[PDB]
Design a binder for this molecule. Structure first.
Ligand SMILES: [Mg+2]
Ligand SMILES: [Mg+2]
Ligand SMILES: [Mg+2]
Ligand SMILES: [Mg+2]
Ligand SMILES: [Mg+2]
Ligand SMILES: [Mg+2]
Ligand SMILES: [Mg+2]
Ligand SMILES: [Mg+2]
Ligand SMILES: [Mg+2]
Ligand SMILES: [Mg+2]
Ligand SMILES: [Mg+2]
Ligand SMILES: [Mg+2]
Ligand SMILES: [Mg+2]
Ligand SMILES: [Mg+2]
Ligand SMILES: [Mg+2]
Ligand SMILES: [Mg+2]
Ligand SMILES: [Mg+2]
Ligand SMILES: [Mg+2]
Ligand SMILES: [Mg+2]
Ligand SMILES: [Mg+2]
Ligand SMILES: [Mg+2]
Ligand SMILES: [Mg+2]
Ligand SMILES: [Mg+2]
Ligand SMILES: [Mg+2]
Ligand SMILES: [Mg+2]
Ligand SMILES: [Mg+2]
Ligand SMILES: [Mg+2]
Ligand SMILES: [Mg+2]
Ligand SMILES: [Mg+2]
Ligand SMILES: [Mg+2]
Ligand SMILES: [Zn+2]
Ligand SMILES: [Zn+2]
Lengths: 53, 56, 96, 55, 124, 71
RNA sequence: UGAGGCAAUAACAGGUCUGUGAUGCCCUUAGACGUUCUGGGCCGCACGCGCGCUACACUGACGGAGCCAGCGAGUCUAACCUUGGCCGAGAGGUCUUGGUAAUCUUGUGAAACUCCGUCGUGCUGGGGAUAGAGCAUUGUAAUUAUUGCUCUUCAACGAGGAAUUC
RNA sequence: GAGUGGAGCCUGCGGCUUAAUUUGACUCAACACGGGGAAACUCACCAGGUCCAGACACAAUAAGGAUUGACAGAUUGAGAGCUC
């Protein structure tokens, strides 16, 4: 009701975040996965990204 | 529906990553130990592998 | 918080029904799936219900997993007055 | 990705890969066998897809 | 004499035509960046700004500048409909009074308010 | 850090006045009642809500602001 | 075999509370160190240091023309990769089109490079800084000029001290 | 061998400047590093304006109303009832 509490959040770094933590900074957006590289390494297993080479 | 195959398979792994979490919190006092997710016709099946199934 | 008794009754009726409530960590949503109220109304009315016992809270990955308990059952059984042994997701469906 | 949460160190880069293998087989048959052969042969983790048609 | 000097020309238009030509006819004769900004967004912008700007220049002590009208829109482009008014062109803190002249046309307000205290190196 | 400055003057809030208010209504000598101040023709304000009486102004407050009847 | 992945014991007061709804303790908490909105700032410029990009041309610049890769990536409850057709000097525009992809973009007709010409050592036609003016694209927003284009302006730099990277 | 170090700009760091010019890091192992290409955002800085999203306990106020909102105007950068 209070027409006074927001401004374009359609694009750029502020539109987004990280589905685990909220960090706008350091986001892997590839493959529509949207994880900050610091939570990407802490999950990379459970997602299925592993280390062959 | 209607997604790319890559995007689908990554998306499924994120679906795994999150589920494992939600259980790894929720069922701590029930000795939760991992999940598996099996897809079929009709249903979508998730099996909690935990060491106290009478409390789940 | 501050919310009319109408939106409290949408929350309390709904939760007594489903026994479990879900809410993504994102105020400024205005309406959330399934409950015709402000998102903020839900989270806060819930956390209110939680700090006094009643319902437990869980978070993980931005999404807040709300679990009604048995004493909590007693309370909206009062708030919705409905008779002793009223409802809750405590009947094991048809034969599923 | 860089290995460090922060910024210090040598600039160790890592690299993660997930392996997506695709296969397709074509069969001509009735409706009974498709339905028989598809409900079973179920496998968690493998994605089975069955279309139809010539277009 | 006879020639009371002569008015300004924006790009071939003297003062008076620009005075009652209309904004849309102005920007139409404005350049690249202007006809773009005026193209897009046509639903509520220099709104009550222009109703205050004109009610000031009306409520004017006659043969004198109108009262300053402050605004934060460092981004407005200057149109003949605002020629001769006094605008408080915010710069970060405090509104810089600036008189709009027939030659500042189509420049942004913010080029007329400095956002930074020059430099002075060494010194003491 | 730095802490505190102020060229003074702090902002207040609101008060919601006082008023025993709803004396507005008049009962004659036993016992006919005639209302005072005119009510709002909006379907949401079932004519129980009234209109504030200023200047030109007659304003519906239940309609948390809505609309502008003037008599 | 070439190249990686993994990798014991132990050590550092190395970095990270500025990735985390990981956290102790301390601070603050309504005249907010909470959050949000408006605007500016991180870009500010006498100048020191580092990583670099483009050059000083003739094994070259320019103009025709020859014409060849590999690792990628791409749009649902949406506007991603974009062929073709016209229009436009250009940037671009516009009507259409294929692709959730070894199927469409794409043979990614890349660039050095090859070839026939022009120039001819002259700060030259090497170099393209700085600036003027006009045109477009992204975006609510382009001023301190997001980027692109045309024209014009035509710097320093004639191979680089001690030093020092790979 | 191909360079850097000299030149032009690009970029980080220092210093100065500044309302602020957010900040970590300073030999190899700091300085095209924080995935750090910042117009809003990001944002931590600066000049200003809102909101509480202060659970819960008890006490107090208080249905003769505890509290909430607002049209216009004044005001405000602003079609913020911020305030009046
Ligand atoms: Mg918001
Ligand atoms: Mg200043
Ligand atoms: Mg009354
Ligand atoms: Mg081998
Ligand atoms: Mg230390
Ligand atoms: Mg950390
Ligand atoms: Mg802390
Ligand atoms: Mg982060
Ligand atoms: Mg963790
Ligand atoms: Mg703080
Ligand atoms: Mg910076
Ligand atoms: Mg240095
Ligand atoms: Mg380096
Ligand atoms: Mg050539
Ligand atoms: Mg290929
Ligand atoms: Mg033309
Ligand atoms: Mg289509
Ligand atoms: Mg020469
Ligand atoms: Mg020359
Ligand atoms: Mg040249
Ligand atoms: Mg600008
Ligand atoms: Mg600046
Ligand atoms: Mg930018
Ligand atoms: Mg040399
Ligand atoms: Mg040498
Ligand atoms: Mg800081
Ligand atoms: Mg070393
Ligand atoms: Mg801001
Ligand atoms: Mg508000
Ligand atoms: Mg309190
Ligand atoms: Zn994260
Ligand atoms: Zn009404």
């Amino acid at each position: 009701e209070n027409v006074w509490f927001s401004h374009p959040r359609r694009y750029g770094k502020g539109s987004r975040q990280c589905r685990v933590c909220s960090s706008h900074t350091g986001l892997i957006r590839k493959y529509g996965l949207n994880i900050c590289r610091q939570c990407f390494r802490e999950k990379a297993n459970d997602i299925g990204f592993n280390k062959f080479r | 529906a209607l997604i790319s195959k890559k995007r689908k398979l990554v998306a499924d792994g994120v679906f795994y990553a999150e589920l494992n979490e939600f259980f790894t919190r929720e069922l701590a006092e029930e000795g939760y130990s991992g999940v598996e997710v099996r897809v079929t016709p009709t249903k979508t099946e998730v099996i909690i592998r935990a060491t106290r199934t009478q409390d789940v | 918080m501050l919310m009319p008794k109408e939106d409290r009754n949408k929350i309390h009726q709904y939760l007594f029904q489903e026994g479990v409530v879900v809410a993504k960590k994102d105020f400024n949503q205005a309406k959330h799936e399934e409950i015709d109220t402000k998102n903020l109304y839900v989270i806060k009315a819930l956390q209110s219900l939680t700090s006094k016992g009643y319902v437990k809270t869980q978070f993980s990955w931005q999404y807040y997993y709300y679990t009604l308990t048995e004493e909590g059952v007693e309370y909206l059984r009062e708030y919705l007055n409905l008779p002793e042994h009223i409802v809750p997701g405590t009947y094991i469906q048809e034969r599923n | 990705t860089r290995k460090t949460p922060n910024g210090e160190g040598s600039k160790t880069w890592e690299t993660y890969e997930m392996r997506i293998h695709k296969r397709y087989i074509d069969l001509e048959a009735p409706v009974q066998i498709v339905k028989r052969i598809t409900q079973i042969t179920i496998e968690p983790g493998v994605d089975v897809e069955v279309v139809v048609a010539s277009n | 004499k006879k020639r009371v000097f002569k008015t300004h020309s924006y790009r071939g238009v003297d003062l008076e035509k620009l005075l009652e030509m209309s904004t849309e006819d102005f920007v139409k004769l404005a350049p690249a960046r202007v006809r773009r900004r005026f193209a897009r967004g046509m639903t509520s912008k220099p709104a009550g700004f222009m109703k205050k700007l004109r009610a000031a220049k009306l409520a004017a002590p006659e043969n004198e500048k109108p009262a300053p009208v402050r605004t934060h829109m460092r981004n407005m482009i200057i149109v003949p409909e605002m020629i001769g008014s006094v605008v408080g062109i915010y710069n970060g803190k405090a509104f810089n009074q600036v008189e709009i002249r027939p030659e500042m046309l189509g420049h942004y307000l913010g080029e007329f308010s400095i956002t930074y205290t020059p430099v002075r190196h060494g010194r003491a | 850090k730095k802490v505190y400055t102020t060229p003074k003057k702090i902002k207040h809030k609101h008060k919601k006045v006082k008023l025993a208010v709803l004396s507005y209504y008049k009962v004659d000598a036993e016992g006919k009642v005639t209302k005072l101040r005119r009510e709002c023709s909006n379907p949401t304000c079932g004519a129980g809500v009234f209109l504030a009486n200023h200047k030109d102004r007659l304003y519906c407050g239940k309609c948390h602001s809505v609309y502008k009847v003037n008599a």
